Amino acid sequence: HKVHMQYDIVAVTASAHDGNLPENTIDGNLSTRWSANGSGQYITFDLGSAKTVNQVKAAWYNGDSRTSGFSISLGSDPASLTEVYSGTSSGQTNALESYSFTATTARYIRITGFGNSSNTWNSITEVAIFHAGEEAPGTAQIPSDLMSNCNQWKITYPDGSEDKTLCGEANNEYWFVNEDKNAMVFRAPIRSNNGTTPNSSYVRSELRERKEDGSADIYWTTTGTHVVYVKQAITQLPIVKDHLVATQIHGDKSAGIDDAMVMRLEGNHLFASFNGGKLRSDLTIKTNYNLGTVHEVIFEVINGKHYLYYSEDGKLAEAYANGSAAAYLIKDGGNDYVMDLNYDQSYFKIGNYTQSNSEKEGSYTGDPNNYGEVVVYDYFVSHQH
Ligand SMILES: [Ca+2]
Ligand SMILES: [K+]
């Protein structure tokens, strides 16, 4: 189900009534009604303040035996109202009918009545006011706009190519700005023979940490304080092997470290994985992760101690900045930290590493919806010693 928010109607007035009061339209009762005789008469609903509205619902007196003509108008003052919908009721139901229009800011909503099939009465039994289907929109045009330092990363695409100079790059099919112009999207489709990427290799659209001037790949150590914060949603998984890696700390394979600490989603299972189980056992974050749920995550390394913070409440960045973030730690038994280990040659990765390919998807390879996807609203990293 798409999400549909319902605004409370705090008051209602009208140009006219015959003793069937305007309040009768919001009492949840099908046997009470508003009535006013004459084309042009209207009822006006008040939401208390201005809200984004894109749907009005009405149920009509004799809604299943006659049709009613009307128009809807919206705005912040009752003399500043602009028309957004006009038409006729269906004549086939006594329940709510949905009338939807361009989302518009309004405090007041007015239905104007033009009589009905039989006579000039306007009569309404129920009315509701809605936004039908959540981060504030932005002004991003290209993915580099969402990066605070566009020099500090390089991207690796699913076609096997790389870009070390992301400042100014255009939106592409693997890395682009979402609709609301507030996030970057890392899309990793599953296809056979995609550029130089082997069919048996897994598929990434993801950032690798660089020096802040972009001169080269950066390597750091577990000594000192090192942080990655990401606000993101995992929005899609492949069809057969619905497995995907988002945020990561990486060291050398040669040292038995490799992908030391990563966030992984398998189905609804969201967990942290430590060199794929070779350092320590997977640690579960959530068993019921729903695709498209915006979360925040921090990996924090302090002289070898690895801490995991997770939140779906929107407040993790604010809390970490205010110093009150302990509430969001993912604890492991009776330890505040999920792992203690020292290594060097370490760097961060952010984005989408989809753990599937053409061999695992087989016949569903090339399918339109056979891709992994990660939407990143915000992120930062810090280093200290
Ligand atoms: Ca009623
Ligand atoms: K470039």
Residue numbers in the entry: -5 to -1, 188 to 315, 322 to 573
Relevant lines from the article:
Alginate is degraded by alginate lyases via a β-elimination mechanism to yield 4,5-unsaturated sugar at the non-reducing end. Persicobacter sp. CCB-QB2, an agarolytic bacterium isolated from seaweed (genus Ulva) in a coastal area of Malaysia9, was found to encode a PL7 alginate lyase, AlyQ, in its genome. Like many multidomain alginate lyases, AlyQ contains two additional carbohydrate-binding modules (CBMs) at its N terminus. AlyQ’s first domain moderately resembles family 16 CBM (CBM16), while the second domain belongs to family 32 CBM (CBM32).
In order to understand the relationship between these CBMs and the catalytic domain, we have characterized AlyQ’s activity and substrate binding, as well as solved the structure of a truncated version containing the CBM32 and catalytic domains. However, only AlyQBC successfully formed crystals, diffracting up to 2.2 Å in space group P41212 with one molecule in the asymmetric unit. In accordance to size-exclusion chromatography results, analysis with Pisa26 showed that all crystal contacts were not significant — AlyQBC exists as a monomer while domains B and C do not interact with one another. Residues E316–N321 in the region linking the two domains were disordered. A Ca2+ ion is found coordinated by the side chains of the strictly conserved D209 and T214, and the main chains of N206, N211, T214 and T307. W124 of YeCBM32, which when substituted with Ala resulted in only very weak affinity for the ligand polygalaturonic acid, is conserved in domain B as W303, and the region around this Trp, which is highly variable and involved in binding different sugars in CBM32 members, is also highly similar between AlyQ and YeCBM32. Moreover, an acetic acid molecule from the crystallisation buffer is found binding to the nearby R248, which may mimic the carboxyl group of an uronic acid. Subsites +1 to +3 are relatively well conserved between the two, and the three key residues for catalysis — Q436 neutralizing the substrate’s carboxyl group, H438 as a general base and Y541 as a general acid — were superposed well with A1-II’s Q189, H191 and Y284 to interact with the ligand, indicating AlyQ also employs a similar mechanism for alginate cleavage. A shift in AlyQ’s loop L1, however, is observed, which may represent the open conformation. Notably, if the GGMG ligand were to bind to AlyQ as it did to A1-II′, it would have crashed with AlyQ’s D446 and D447 at subsites +1 and −1 — D447 would especially repel the carboxyl group at subsite −1.
